[PDB]
Amino acid sequence: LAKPQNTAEVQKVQLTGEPVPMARCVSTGGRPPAQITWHSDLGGMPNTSQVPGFLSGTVTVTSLWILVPSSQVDGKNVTCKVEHESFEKPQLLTVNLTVYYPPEVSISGYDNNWYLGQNEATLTCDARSNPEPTGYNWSTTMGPLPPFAVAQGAQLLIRPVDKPINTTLICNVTNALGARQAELTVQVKEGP
Ligand SMILES: *[C@@H]1O[C@H](CO[C@@H]2O[C@@H](C)[C@@H](O)[C@@H](O)[C@@H]2O)[C@@H](O[C@@H]2O[C@H](CO)[C@@H](O[C@@H]3O[C@H](CO)[C@@H](O)[C@H](O)[C@@H]3O)[C@H](O)[C@H]2NC(C)=O)[C@H](O)[C@H]1NC(C)=O
Ligand SMILES: *[C@@H]1O[C@H](CO)[C@@H](O[C@@H]2O[C@H](CO)[C@@H](O[C@@H]3O[C@H](CO)[C@@H](O)[C@H](O)[C@@H]3O)[C@H](O)[C@H]2NC(C)=O)[C@H](O)[C@H]1NC(C)=O
Ligand SMILES: *[C@@H]1O[C@H](CO)[C@@H](O[C@@H]2O[C@H](CO)[C@@H](O)[C@H](O)[C@H]2NC(C)=O)[C@H](O)[C@H]1NC(C)=O
Ligand SMILES: *[C@@H]1O[C@H](CO)[C@@H](O[C@@H]2O[C@H](CO)[C@@H](O)[C@H](O)[C@H]2NC(C)=O)[C@H](O)[C@H]1NC(C)=O
Ligand SMILES: *[C@@H]1O[C@H](CO)[C@@H](O)[C@H](O)[C@H]1NC(C)=O
């Protein structure tokens, strides 16, 4: 028998409809051939294959992990387990998935309890994409931003109001692949 060594890269992927290979794992020069299995919180479909090795009697196994690409998987871990009767213990190889996609946006920092004459409250335009977003843009459903709302990069500062107002905000985010956007209505009364 022969002790074979192995590798594993990460096959970068876009947002195609079909299930494509997102991670490869390979054990070259096995005798006998090695056993390759995958383990992770988000299992899919592993497709294995093998070609003759270098020294007569050996075999190199090449297994790829196929899955239907999706935004929440970017950054997640996938582990390949190469087990063979010649190692001290089953060897473990881990890859760091990668998926490019348009920006998914949302706005936080608003508790329906906004009243007249309060202190400066600021909202953040939460956005998760790959690769990182290149530009942020604030505007209103009416066109230009009201005078009490001054834009600050990826955040919008809301100053004190003298009289009640209404305005649905829009955060247009642009990264290297596209440009998306969120919506959001905000109110300020008097009450107590
Ligand atoms: C901010 O807007 C509110 C109302 O907000 C409401 O929802 C928004 C998304 C828009 O669709 C608005 O058009 C809509 O009003 C203003 O106060 C609202 O005024 C309207 C009419 O002036 C009130 O209509 C009432 O409807 C109820 C039943 O739904 C009837 O019982 C009443 O008789 C009356 O017809 C509406 O009730 C009232 N909304 C609230 C929550 O009180 C508000 O004036 C505006 N801000 C400022 C500073 O003017
Ligand atoms: C897979 O690898 C990627 C990058 O190779 C990892 O992304 C990295 O995520 C960490 C934490 O989530 C980021 O580190 C933090 O950076 C900020 C700087 O903004 C710093 O303030 C923090 O103290 C911390 O160091 C890191 O920026 C980010 N890498 C890149 C290139 O953006 C990802 O976590 C890996 N995924 C898994 C499942 O291991
Ligand atoms: C694993 O993938 C291989 C190819 O990587 C599949 O082989 C294909 O087989 C289909 C029919 O089943 C053929 O139409 C293709 O030409 C083959 N593709 C290649 C690249 O050879 C194989 O079917 C897959 N294994 C399993 C068990 O599904
Ligand atoms: C995801 O994979 C990374 C490696 O890319 C893991 O990082 C290891 O963390 C352990 C314990 O924290 C360390 O002993 C190792 O040194 C780290 N690996 C490297 C190469 O530095 C991480 O544990 C994994 N996390 C998840 C959630 O899967
Ligand atoms: C968002 O910003 C991009 C970049 O300039 C622009 O082309 C696009 O028209 C904007 N989208 C909307 C809905 O305003």
mmCIF file of C-alpha atoms and ligand atoms in Angstrom:
data_model
loop_
_atom_site.group_PDB
_atom_site.id
_atom_site.type_symbol
_atom_site.label_atom_id
_atom_site.label_comp_id
_atom_site.label_asym_id
_atom_site.label_seq_id
_atom_site.Cartn_x
_atom_site.Cartn_y
_atom_site.Cartn_z
ATOM 1 C CA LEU A 1 0.000 0.000 0.000
ATOM 2 C CA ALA A 2 0.966 3.659 -0.659
ATOM 3 C CA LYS A 3 0.338 6.800 1.449
ATOM 4 C CA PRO A 4 -1.241 9.526 -0.708
ATOM 5 C CA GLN A 5 -1.355 13.272 0.035
ATOM 6 C CA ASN A 6 -4.250 15.612 -0.798
ATOM 7 C CA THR A 7 -5.627 19.118 -1.617
ATOM 8 C CA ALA A 8 -8.833 21.214 -1.897
ATOM 9 C CA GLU A 9 -9.612 24.681 -3.347
ATOM 10 C CA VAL A 10 -12.823 26.712 -3.547
ATOM 11 C CA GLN A 11 -14.558 27.120 -6.920
ATOM 12 C CA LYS A 12 -15.765 30.752 -6.930
ATOM 13 C CA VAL A 13 -19.362 31.070 -8.229
ATOM 14 C CA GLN A 14 -22.007 33.525 -9.537
ATOM 15 C CA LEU A 15 -25.786 33.189 -9.060
ATOM 16 C CA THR A 16 -26.590 30.634 -11.774
ATOM 17 C CA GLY A 17 -29.858 28.668 -11.701
ATOM 18 C CA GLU A 18 -28.320 25.178 -11.746
ATOM 19 C CA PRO A 19 -26.313 23.265 -9.101
ATOM 20 C CA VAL A 20 -22.623 23.760 -9.891
ATOM 21 C CA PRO A 21 -19.345 22.659 -8.268
ATOM 22 C CA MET A 22 -18.461 25.071 -5.448
ATOM 23 C CA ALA A 23 -15.618 23.090 -3.832
ATOM 24 C CA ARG A 24 -13.050 20.528 -5.075
ATOM 25 C CA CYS A 25 -11.113 17.953 -3.011
ATOM 26 C CA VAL A 26 -8.365 15.635 -4.371
ATOM 27 C CA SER A 27 -6.256 12.735 -3.009
ATOM 28 C CA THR A 28 -3.394 11.917 -5.418
ATOM 29 C CA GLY A 29 -1.400 8.644 -5.379
ATOM 30 C CA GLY A 30 -3.566 6.253 -3.338
ATOM 31 C CA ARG A 31 -3.043 2.537 -2.595
ATOM 32 C CA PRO A 32 -5.592 1.435 -2.102
ATOM 33 C CA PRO A 33 -7.840 4.284 -3.306
ATOM 34 C CA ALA A 34 -8.939 6.752 -0.608
ATOM 35 C CA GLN A 35 -12.409 7.425 0.860
ATOM 36 C CA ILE A 36 -13.600 11.029 0.427
ATOM 37 C CA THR A 37 -16.633 12.306 2.357
ATOM 38 C CA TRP A 38 -18.094 15.789 2.976
ATOM 39 C CA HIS A 39 -19.423 17.283 6.235
ATOM 40 C CA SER A 40 -21.140 20.645 6.906
ATOM 41 C CA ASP A 41 -24.276 22.382 8.253
ATOM 42 C CA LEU A 42 -25.475 22.832 4.654
ATOM 43 C CA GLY A 43 -25.118 19.472 2.853
ATOM 44 C CA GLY A 44 -25.631 19.014 -0.900
ATOM 45 C CA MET A 45 -24.504 16.595 -3.652
ATOM 46 C CA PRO A 46 -20.988 15.122 -3.872
ATOM 47 C CA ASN A 47 -19.845 13.654 -7.207
ATOM 48 C CA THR A 48 -16.678 11.514 -7.116
ATOM 49 C CA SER A 49 -14.382 10.120 -9.855
ATOM 50 C CA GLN A 50 -10.872 8.607 -10.177
ATOM 51 C CA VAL A 51 -7.994 8.171 -12.673
ATOM 52 C CA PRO A 52 -4.924 5.900 -12.495
ATOM 53 C CA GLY A 53 -2.067 7.238 -10.329
ATOM 54 C CA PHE A 54 1.663 7.652 -10.998
ATOM 55 C CA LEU A 55 3.219 4.455 -9.600
ATOM 56 C CA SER A 56 1.558 1.283 -10.912
ATOM 57 C CA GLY A 57 -1.205 0.230 -8.508
ATOM 58 C CA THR A 58 -1.985 3.717 -7.198
ATOM 59 C CA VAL A 59 -5.122 5.795 -7.827
ATOM 60 C CA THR A 60 -5.941 9.513 -7.560
ATOM 61 C CA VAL A 61 -9.497 10.306 -6.432
ATOM 62 C CA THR A 62 -11.021 13.673 -7.392
ATOM 63 C CA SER A 63 -14.295 14.598 -5.657
ATOM 64 C CA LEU A 64 -16.264 17.848 -6.117
ATOM 65 C CA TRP A 65 -19.098 19.173 -3.893
ATOM 66 C CA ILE A 66 -22.076 20.398 -6.013
ATOM 67 C CA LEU A 67 -24.824 22.779 -4.798
ATOM 68 C CA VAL A 68 -27.315 25.411 -5.992
ATOM 69 C CA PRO A 69 -25.606 28.777 -5.226
ATOM 70 C CA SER A 70 -27.238 31.184 -2.740
ATOM 71 C CA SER A 71 -26.211 34.424 -0.973
ATOM 72 C CA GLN A 72 -26.396 33.170 2.646
ATOM 73 C CA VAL A 73 -23.735 30.519 1.958
ATOM 74 C CA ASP A 74 -20.936 32.970 1.142
ATOM 75 C CA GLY A 75 -18.357 32.765 3.948
ATOM 76 C CA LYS A 76 -19.640 29.447 5.360
ATOM 77 C CA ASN A 77 -17.450 26.374 6.054
ATOM 78 C CA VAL A 78 -17.424 23.067 4.153
ATOM 79 C CA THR A 79 -15.105 20.238 5.258
ATOM 80 C CA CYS A 80 -13.621 17.399 3.161
ATOM 81 C CA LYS A 81 -12.656 14.206 5.010
ATOM 82 C CA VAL A 82 -9.960 12.064 3.373
ATOM 83 C CA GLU A 83 -9.762 8.719 5.183
ATOM 84 C CA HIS A 84 -7.199 6.000 4.325
ATOM 85 C CA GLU A 85 -5.708 2.963 6.165
ATOM 86 C CA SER A 86 -2.268 4.603 6.211
ATOM 87 C CA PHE A 87 -2.761 7.846 8.156
ATOM 88 C CA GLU A 88 -2.637 8.238 11.945
ATOM 89 C CA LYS A 89 -6.248 9.466 11.821
ATOM 90 C CA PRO A 90 -8.709 10.555 9.119
ATOM 91 C CA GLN A 91 -7.307 13.811 7.675
ATOM 92 C CA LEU A 92 -9.566 16.882 7.613
ATOM 93 C CA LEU A 93 -9.404 19.626 4.960
ATOM 94 C CA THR A 94 -11.668 22.705 5.181
ATOM 95 C CA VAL A 95 -12.663 25.298 2.542
ATOM 96 C CA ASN A 96 -14.170 28.813 2.796
ATOM 97 C CA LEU A 97 -17.019 29.148 0.253
ATOM 98 C CA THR A 98 -17.308 32.202 -2.009
ATOM 99 C CA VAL A 99 -20.377 33.560 -3.830
ATOM 100 C CA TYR A 100 -20.646 36.899 -5.666
ATOM 101 C CA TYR A 101 -24.058 38.640 -5.561
ATOM 102 C CA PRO A 102 -25.994 41.957 -5.727
ATOM 103 C CA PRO A 103 -26.652 43.970 -2.531
ATOM 104 C CA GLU A 104 -29.478 42.914 -0.184
ATOM 105 C CA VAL A 105 -30.570 46.051 1.720
ATOM 106 C CA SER A 106 -32.608 46.997 4.818
ATOM 107 C CA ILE A 107 -32.864 50.010 7.186
ATOM 108 C CA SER A 108 -32.679 49.936 11.014
ATOM 109 C CA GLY A 109 -32.902 52.453 13.886
ATOM 110 C CA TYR A 110 -36.620 53.332 14.040
ATOM 111 C CA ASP A 111 -38.935 52.750 17.012
ATOM 112 C CA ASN A 112 -42.364 54.209 16.194
ATOM 113 C CA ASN A 113 -41.856 56.477 19.251
ATOM 114 C CA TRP A 114 -40.323 59.547 17.525
ATOM 115 C CA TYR A 115 -41.754 62.835 18.881
ATOM 116 C CA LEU A 116 -41.289 66.619 18.502
ATOM 117 C CA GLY A 117 -38.124 68.163 19.989
ATOM 118 C CA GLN A 118 -36.221 64.935 20.689
ATOM 119 C CA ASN A 119 -32.433 64.541 20.453
ATOM 120 C CA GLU A 120 -30.481 63.621 17.293
ATOM 121 C CA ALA A 121 -31.391 60.043 16.311
ATOM 122 C CA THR A 122 -29.460 58.296 13.514
ATOM 123 C CA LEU A 123 -30.385 55.367 11.230
ATOM 124 C CA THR A 124 -28.045 52.873 9.523
ATOM 125 C CA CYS A 125 -28.444 51.414 6.014
ATOM 126 C CA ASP A 126 -27.597 47.743 6.608
ATOM 127 C CA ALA A 127 -26.244 46.099 3.438
ATOM 128 C CA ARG A 128 -24.613 42.701 2.795
ATOM 129 C CA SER A 129 -23.063 41.920 -0.615
ATOM 130 C CA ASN A 130 -19.956 40.495 -2.312
ATOM 131 C CA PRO A 131 -17.735 42.051 -3.028
ATOM 132 C CA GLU A 132 -18.199 44.923 -0.541
ATOM 133 C CA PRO A 133 -20.425 47.802 -1.778
ATOM 134 C CA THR A 134 -18.736 50.710 -3.566
ATOM 135 C CA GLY A 135 -21.359 53.431 -3.024
ATOM 136 C CA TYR A 136 -24.319 54.575 -0.896
ATOM 137 C CA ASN A 137 -27.094 57.051 -1.841
ATOM 138 C CA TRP A 138 -29.915 58.639 0.212
ATOM 139 C CA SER A 139 -33.144 60.060 -1.259
ATOM 140 C CA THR A 140 -36.892 60.302 -0.545
ATOM 141 C CA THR A 141 -40.066 59.024 -2.223
ATOM 142 C CA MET A 142 -40.674 62.680 -3.074
ATOM 143 C CA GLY A 143 -37.268 63.349 -4.654
ATOM 144 C CA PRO A 144 -34.783 65.395 -2.587
ATOM 145 C CA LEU A 145 -34.129 64.762 1.131
ATOM 146 C CA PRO A 146 -36.052 66.958 3.591
ATOM 147 C CA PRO A 147 -33.926 69.596 5.374
ATOM 148 C CA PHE A 148 -34.069 67.901 8.807
ATOM 149 C CA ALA A 149 -32.466 64.726 7.424
ATOM 150 C CA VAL A 150 -28.755 65.158 6.626
ATOM 151 C CA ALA A 151 -26.970 62.230 4.943
ATOM 152 C CA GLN A 152 -23.751 60.813 6.431
ATOM 153 C CA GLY A 153 -22.139 58.127 4.268
ATOM 154 C CA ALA A 154 -23.965 54.873 4.995
ATOM 155 C CA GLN A 155 -26.110 56.494 7.706
ATOM 156 C CA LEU A 156 -28.735 59.272 7.846
ATOM 157 C CA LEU A 157 -28.914 61.701 10.801
ATOM 158 C CA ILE A 158 -32.406 62.853 11.887
ATOM 159 C CA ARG A 159 -32.460 66.262 13.631
ATOM 160 C CA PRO A 160 -35.216 67.683 15.899
ATOM 161 C CA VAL A 161 -38.484 68.713 14.212
ATOM 162 C CA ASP A 162 -40.472 71.872 14.964
ATOM 163 C CA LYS A 163 -43.645 70.523 13.285
ATOM 164 C CA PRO A 164 -44.986 66.981 12.449
ATOM 165 C CA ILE A 165 -43.743 65.372 9.191
ATOM 166 C CA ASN A 166 -44.022 62.288 6.930
ATOM 167 C CA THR A 167 -41.486 60.841 4.470
ATOM 168 C CA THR A 168 -40.762 57.407 2.983
ATOM 169 C CA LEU A 169 -36.969 56.974 2.715
ATOM 170 C CA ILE A 170 -34.952 55.189 -0.012
ATOM 171 C CA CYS A 171 -31.386 53.808 0.291
ATOM 172 C CA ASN A 172 -29.924 53.076 -3.178
ATOM 173 C CA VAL A 173 -26.809 50.873 -2.767
ATOM 174 C CA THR A 174 -24.278 50.173 -5.556
ATOM 175 C CA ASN A 175 -21.554 47.493 -5.546
ATOM 176 C CA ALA A 176 -19.310 46.101 -8.300
ATOM 177 C CA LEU A 177 -22.065 43.864 -9.735
ATOM 178 C CA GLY A 178 -25.284 45.940 -9.533
ATOM 179 C CA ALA A 179 -27.490 48.382 -7.598
ATOM 180 C CA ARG A 180 -30.397 47.573 -5.233
ATOM 181 C CA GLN A 181 -32.596 49.457 -2.702
ATOM 182 C CA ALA A 182 -34.830 49.465 0.450
ATOM 183 C CA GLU A 183 -38.011 51.378 1.427
ATOM 184 C CA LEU A 184 -39.223 52.809 4.821
ATOM 185 C CA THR A 185 -41.941 55.160 6.194
ATOM 186 C CA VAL A 186 -41.211 57.262 9.325
ATOM 187 C CA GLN A 187 -43.449 59.434 11.568
ATOM 188 C CA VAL A 188 -43.064 62.049 14.368
ATOM 189 C CA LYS A 189 -46.046 63.142 16.531
ATOM 190 C CA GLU A 190 -46.444 64.952 19.859
ATOM 191 C CA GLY A 191 -48.291 62.536 22.161
ATOM 192 C CA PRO A 192 -47.289 62.872 25.833
HETATM 193 C C1 LIG B 1 -48.828 61.782 8.201
HETATM 194 O O1 LIG B 1 -49.789 60.878 7.703
HETATM 195 C C2 LIG B 1 -50.880 60.688 8.570
HETATM 196 C C3 LIG B 1 -51.723 59.531 8.045
HETATM 197 O O2 LIG B 1 -50.866 58.547 7.505
HETATM 198 C C4 LIG B 1 -51.645 57.624 6.723
HETATM 199 O O3 LIG B 1 -50.862 56.630 6.100
HETATM 200 C C5 LIG B 1 -49.891 57.172 5.230
HETATM 201 C C6 LIG B 1 -48.990 56.056 4.714
HETATM 202 C C7 LIG B 1 -50.586 57.884 4.077
HETATM 203 O O4 LIG B 1 -51.322 56.946 3.323
HETATM 204 C C8 LIG B 1 -51.522 58.963 4.604
HETATM 205 O O5 LIG B 1 -52.293 59.481 3.541
HETATM 206 C C9 LIG B 1 -52.443 58.394 5.678
HETATM 207 O O6 LIG B 1 -53.137 59.448 6.306
HETATM 208 C C10 LIG B 1 -51.675 61.984 8.632
HETATM 209 O O7 LIG B 1 -52.767 61.829 9.511
HETATM 210 C C11 LIG B 1 -53.837 61.151 8.829
HETATM 211 O O8 LIG B 1 -54.748 62.056 8.239
HETATM 212 C C12 LIG B 1 -55.757 61.407 7.497
HETATM 213 C C13 LIG B 1 -56.583 62.438 6.738
HETATM 214 O O9 LIG B 1 -56.010 63.718 6.906
HETATM 215 C C14 LIG B 1 -56.627 60.610 8.458
HETATM 216 O O10 LIG B 1 -57.669 59.966 7.761
HETATM 217 C C15 LIG B 1 -58.512 59.320 8.731
HETATM 218 O O11 LIG B 1 -58.814 57.967 8.402
HETATM 219 C C16 LIG B 1 -59.474 57.305 9.479
HETATM 220 C C17 LIG B 1 -59.634 55.828 9.143
HETATM 221 O O12 LIG B 1 -58.435 55.354 8.519
HETATM 222 C C18 LIG B 1 -60.827 57.963 9.730
HETATM 223 O O13 LIG B 1 -61.455 57.352 10.863
HETATM 224 C C19 LIG B 1 -60.669 59.458 9.988
HETATM 225 O O14 LIG B 1 -61.958 60.080 10.004
HETATM 226 C C20 LIG B 1 -59.806 60.103 8.913
HETATM 227 O O15 LIG B 1 -60.528 60.129 7.677
HETATM 228 C C21 LIG B 1 -55.781 59.574 9.186
HETATM 229 O O16 LIG B 1 -56.557 58.963 10.191
HETATM 230 C C22 LIG B 1 -54.552 60.226 9.810
HETATM 231 N N1 LIG B 1 -53.639 59.198 10.278
HETATM 232 C C23 LIG B 1 -53.403 59.005 11.575
HETATM 233 C C24 LIG B 1 -52.437 57.911 11.925
HETATM 234 O O17 LIG B 1 -53.935 59.673 12.461
HETATM 235 C C25 LIG B 1 -50.783 63.122 9.119
HETATM 236 O O18 LIG B 1 -51.458 64.350 8.951
HETATM 237 C C26 LIG B 1 -49.454 63.168 8.364
HETATM 238 N N2 LIG B 1 -48.530 64.047 9.059
HETATM 239 C C27 LIG B 1 -48.721 65.363 9.115
HETATM 240 C C28 LIG B 1 -47.692 66.158 9.866
HETATM 241 O O19 LIG B 1 -49.681 65.925 8.589
HETATM 242 C C1 LIG B 2 -13.893 33.338 4.993
HETATM 243 O O1 LIG B 2 -12.889 34.304 4.760
HETATM 244 C C2 LIG B 2 -13.370 35.627 4.714
HETATM 245 C C3 LIG B 2 -12.257 36.543 4.215
HETATM 246 O O2 LIG B 2 -11.169 35.760 3.772
HETATM 247 C C4 LIG B 2 -13.838 36.034 6.103
HETATM 248 O O3 LIG B 2 -14.360 37.347 6.061
HETATM 249 C C5 LIG B 2 -13.818 38.132 7.141
HETATM 250 O O4 LIG B 2 -14.713 38.253 8.221
HETATM 251 C C6 LIG B 2 -14.081 38.772 9.370
HETATM 252 C C7 LIG B 2 -15.068 38.738 10.530
HETATM 253 O O5 LIG B 2 -16.346 38.386 10.045
HETATM 254 C C8 LIG B 2 -13.576 40.196 9.133
HETATM 255 O O6 LIG B 2 -12.665 40.512 10.166
HETATM 256 C C9 LIG B 2 -12.984 41.783 10.760
HETATM 257 O O7 LIG B 2 -12.558 42.881 9.955
HETATM 258 C C10 LIG B 2 -12.929 44.150 10.498
HETATM 259 C C11 LIG B 2 -12.507 45.248 9.529
HETATM 260 O O8 LIG B 2 -13.693 45.860 8.956
HETATM 261 C C12 LIG B 2 -12.271 44.354 11.858
HETATM 262 O O9 LIG B 2 -12.737 45.580 12.433
HETATM 263 C C13 LIG B 2 -12.604 43.204 12.799
HETATM 264 O O10 LIG B 2 -11.824 43.320 13.994
HETATM 265 C C14 LIG B 2 -12.312 41.869 12.125
HETATM 266 O O11 LIG B 2 -10.897 41.714 11.967
HETATM 267 C C15 LIG B 2 -12.866 40.369 7.791
HETATM 268 O O12 LIG B 2 -12.902 41.733 7.427
HETATM 269 C C16 LIG B 2 -13.476 39.536 6.664
HETATM 270 N N1 LIG B 2 -12.550 39.477 5.548
HETATM 271 C C17 LIG B 2 -12.666 40.289 4.498
HETATM 272 C C18 LIG B 2 -11.646 40.128 3.410
HETATM 273 O O13 LIG B 2 -13.555 41.134 4.401
HETATM 274 C C19 LIG B 2 -14.905 35.056 6.583
HETATM 275 O O14 LIG B 2 -15.169 35.287 7.949
HETATM 276 C C20 LIG B 2 -14.480 33.598 6.385
HETATM 277 N N2 LIG B 2 -15.621 32.734 6.632
HETATM 278 C C21 LIG B 2 -15.560 31.726 7.499
HETATM 279 C C22 LIG B 2 -16.808 30.909 7.663
HETATM 280 O O15 LIG B 2 -14.548 31.455 8.146
HETATM 281 C C1 LIG B 3 -20.880 13.127 -12.032
HETATM 282 O O1 LIG B 3 -20.422 14.028 -13.015
HETATM 283 C C2 LIG B 3 -20.013 13.390 -14.197
HETATM 284 C C3 LIG B 3 -19.263 14.381 -15.077
HETATM 285 O O2 LIG B 3 -18.517 15.263 -14.261
HETATM 286 C C4 LIG B 3 -21.274 12.884 -14.875
HETATM 287 O O3 LIG B 3 -20.956 12.354 -16.143
HETATM 288 C C5 LIG B 3 -21.931 12.833 -17.086
HETATM 289 O O4 LIG B 3 -22.909 11.860 -17.372
HETATM 290 C C6 LIG B 3 -23.951 12.388 -18.157
HETATM 291 C C7 LIG B 3 -25.093 11.381 -18.229
HETATM 292 O O5 LIG B 3 -25.327 10.847 -16.940
HETATM 293 C C8 LIG B 3 -23.402 12.709 -19.541
HETATM 294 O O6 LIG B 3 -24.425 13.266 -20.336
HETATM 295 C C9 LIG B 3 -22.244 13.695 -19.445
HETATM 296 O O7 LIG B 3 -21.585 13.766 -20.691
HETATM 297 C C10 LIG B 3 -21.241 13.293 -18.368
HETATM 298 N N1 LIG B 3 -20.376 14.421 -18.081
HETATM 299 C C11 LIG B 3 -19.050 14.306 -18.085
HETATM 300 C C12 LIG B 3 -18.271 15.551 -17.772
HETATM 301 O O8 LIG B 3 -18.470 13.249 -18.327
HETATM 302 C C13 LIG B 3 -21.923 11.825 -13.995
HETATM 303 O O9 LIG B 3 -23.201 11.515 -14.506
HETATM 304 C C14 LIG B 3 -22.055 12.281 -12.541
HETATM 305 N N2 LIG B 3 -22.216 11.107 -11.700
HETATM 306 C C15 LIG B 3 -23.390 10.775 -11.166
HETATM 307 C C16 LIG B 3 -23.410 9.536 -10.319
HETATM 308 O O10 LIG B 3 -24.418 11.427 -11.341
HETATM 309 C C1 LIG B 4 -14.148 28.044 9.477
HETATM 310 O O1 LIG B 4 -12.860 27.795 8.946
HETATM 311 C C2 LIG B 4 -11.798 28.444 9.610
HETATM 312 C C3 LIG B 4 -10.508 28.223 8.829
HETATM 313 O O2 LIG B 4 -10.572 28.916 7.601
HETATM 314 C C4 LIG B 4 -11.665 27.902 11.026
HETATM 315 O O3 LIG B 4 -10.619 28.591 11.687
HETATM 316 C C5 LIG B 4 -9.914 27.727 12.605
HETATM 317 O O4 LIG B 4 -10.329 27.931 13.938
HETATM 318 C C6 LIG B 4 -9.723 27.042 14.853
HETATM 319 C C7 LIG B 4 -10.347 27.237 16.230
HETATM 320 O O5 LIG B 4 -10.927 28.524 16.300
HETATM 321 C C8 LIG B 4 -8.223 27.297 14.901
HETATM 322 O O6 LIG B 4 -7.615 26.372 15.776
HETATM 323 C C9 LIG B 4 -7.618 27.159 13.511
HETATM 324 O O7 LIG B 4 -6.281 27.607 13.530
HETATM 325 C C10 LIG B 4 -8.409 27.972 12.493
HETATM 326 N N1 LIG B 4 -7.932 27.647 11.162
HETATM 327 C C11 LIG B 4 -6.970 28.358 10.582
HETATM 328 C C12 LIG B 4 -6.557 27.931 9.205
HETATM 329 O O8 LIG B 4 -6.429 29.322 11.125
HETATM 330 C C13 LIG B 4 -12.980 28.109 11.765
HETATM 331 O O9 LIG B 4 -12.937 27.404 12.986
HETATM 332 C C14 LIG B 4 -14.191 27.637 10.953
HETATM 333 N N2 LIG B 4 -15.397 28.166 11.561
HETATM 334 C C15 LIG B 4 -16.606 27.711 11.244
HETATM 335 C C16 LIG B 4 -17.767 28.347 11.949
HETATM 336 O O10 LIG B 4 -16.791 26.816 10.420
HETATM 337 C C1 LIG B 5 -29.240 53.944 -8.046
HETATM 338 O O1 LIG B 5 -27.947 54.459 -8.295
HETATM 339 C C2 LIG B 5 -27.422 54.091 -9.550
HETATM 340 C C3 LIG B 5 -25.967 54.539 -9.641
HETATM 341 O O2 LIG B 5 -25.915 55.878 -10.081
HETATM 342 C C4 LIG B 5 -28.257 54.742 -10.641
HETATM 343 O O3 LIG B 5 -27.754 54.379 -11.905
HETATM 344 C C5 LIG B 5 -29.708 54.295 -10.519
HETATM 345 O O4 LIG B 5 -30.504 55.051 -11.404
HETATM 346 C C6 LIG B 5 -30.225 54.468 -9.092
HETATM 347 N N1 LIG B 5 -31.501 53.787 -8.962
HETATM 348 C C7 LIG B 5 -32.606 54.427 -8.584
HETATM 349 C C8 LIG B 5 -33.857 53.606 -8.490
HETATM 350 O O5 LIG B 5 -32.631 55.629 -8.320
#
